[PDB]
Amino acid sequence: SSVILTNYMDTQYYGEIGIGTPPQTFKVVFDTGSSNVWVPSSKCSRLYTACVYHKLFDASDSSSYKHNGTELTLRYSTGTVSGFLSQDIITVGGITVTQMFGEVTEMPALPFMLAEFDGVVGMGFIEQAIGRVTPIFDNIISQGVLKEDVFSFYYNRDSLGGQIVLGGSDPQHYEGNFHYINLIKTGVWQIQMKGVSVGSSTLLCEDGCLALVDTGASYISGSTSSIEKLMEALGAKKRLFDYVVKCNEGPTLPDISFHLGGKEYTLTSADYVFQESYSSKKLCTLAIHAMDIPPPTGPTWALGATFIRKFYTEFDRRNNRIGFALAR
Numbered sequence: 357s358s359v360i361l362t363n364y365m366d367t368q369y370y371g372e373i374g375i376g377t378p379p380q381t382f383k384v385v386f387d388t389g390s391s392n393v394w395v396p397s398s399k400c401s402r403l404y405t406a407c408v409y410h411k412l413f414d415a416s417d418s419s420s421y422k423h424n425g426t427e428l429t430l431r432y433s434t435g436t437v438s439g440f441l442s443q444d445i446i447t448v449g450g451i452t453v454t455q456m457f458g459e460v461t462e463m464p465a466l467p468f469m470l471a472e473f474d475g476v477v478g479m480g481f482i483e484q485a486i487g488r489v490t491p492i493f494d495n496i497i498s499q500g501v502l503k504e505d506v507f508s509f510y511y512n513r514d515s516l517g518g519q520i521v522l523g524g525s526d527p528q529h530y531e532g533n534f535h536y537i538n539l540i541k542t543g544v545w546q547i548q549m550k551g552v553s554v555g556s557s558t559l560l561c562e563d564g565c566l567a568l569v570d571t572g573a574s575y576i577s578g579s580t581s582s583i584e585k586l587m588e589a590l591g592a593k594k595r596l597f598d599y600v601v602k603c604n605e606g607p608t609l610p611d612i613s614f615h616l617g618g619k620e621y622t623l624t625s626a627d628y629v630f631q632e633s634y635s636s637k638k639l640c641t642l643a644i645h646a647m648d649i650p651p652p653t654g655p656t657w658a659l660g661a662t663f664i665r666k667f668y669t670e671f672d673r674r675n676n677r678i679g680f681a682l683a684r
């Protein structure tokens with residue numbers, strides 16, 4: 357089964373799901389870096405800006421809704437956000453499942469209030485599900501209709517916007533052969549990166565740092581120290597919320613590579629700077645940024661949309677691995 361995705365300025369890739377009877381539709385991101393299903397609830401007080409311009413879920417218009425109401429909580433660097441657990445039929449790419457999701461009653465506004473999509477679908481493992489709730493993909497496996505205990509991602513360059521494939525891969529969007537990397541500590545789609553490189557000066561992640569293959573992440577992230585180092589060491593200036601470089605001097609910034617289980621994944625200037633134009637006047641942003649991630653998971657890096665745009669990604673639960681292939 358394939359889920360068509362939409363790309364909002366190469367920074368947000370979402371899809372559509374259906375909750376309830378009749379199907380209440382939600383625009384959502386499929387995040388391999390989280391494990392629950394979250395949708396803005398209708399019972400979400402309007403006092404939260406995140407609950408004013410996004411589809412809300414009304415249990416009141418669903419014949420299939422089942423009440424549980426367990427309070428869920430998750431603090432996210434601007435943390436807070438909470439709600440309760442509800443059950444109901446969700447539909448993804450044709451498939452139907454009786455899933456447990458959270459209805460957001462409280463939300464820290466940002467970043468959400470800027471989301472062109474409404475909710476998030478956790479593609480992560482059951483080991484990290486709030487309330488220890490069975491993840492959606494897990495439930496889909498239970499039905500035994502798929503072909504492979506796997507699912508692949510494809511983020512496009514923007515302006516088809518993207519595509520997720522449940523239970524398989526799609527050859528139309530990648531070339532070459534998948535080179536796999538085993539998961540460090542299964543329970544997380546995290547792999548053992550072996551050094552980041554800025555081309556000549558392979559100074560970074562020397563030894564053995566970690567890396568998250570986060571589809572729900574738009575940029576590539578690393579500790580604040582790491583990013584600072586990598587940043588200026590590119591001619592990249594630091595701003596209020598993202599590094600940049602005069603637009604006209606972007607096309608000649610070094611290449612970035614990630615030594616991942618046997619191969620060198622390289623991103624070029626084109627892959628990491630939004631070349632709004634080539635003016636020698638205006639500034640241009642880099643699809644990279646600080647972001648400090650807390651343990652036990654981190655501080656690991658985060659290979660998000662920037663990476664995925666270039667390398668088609670497959671997550672294979674069957675063998676706790678992850679493949680990468682030149683995206684086409």
Ligand SMILES: COC(=O)Cn1ccc2ccc(OC[C@H]3CNCC(=O)N3c3ccc(OCCCOCc4ccccc4OC)cc3)cc21
Nearest residue numbers: 367368369389390394467468471474475476572573574661
């Ligand atoms: C290419 O990716 C993008 O463009 C992603 N992107 C853009 C804006 C943005 C915001 C949150 C995010 O989420 C990113 C994930 C990232 N991976 C780890 C993780 O833990 N995440 C995460 C964060 C926050 C969550 O909040 C759930 C509250 C329910 O409510 C969530 C909610 C309610 C109302 C409106 C939107 C909304 O967000 C889906 C759930 C999952 C990714 C985002």
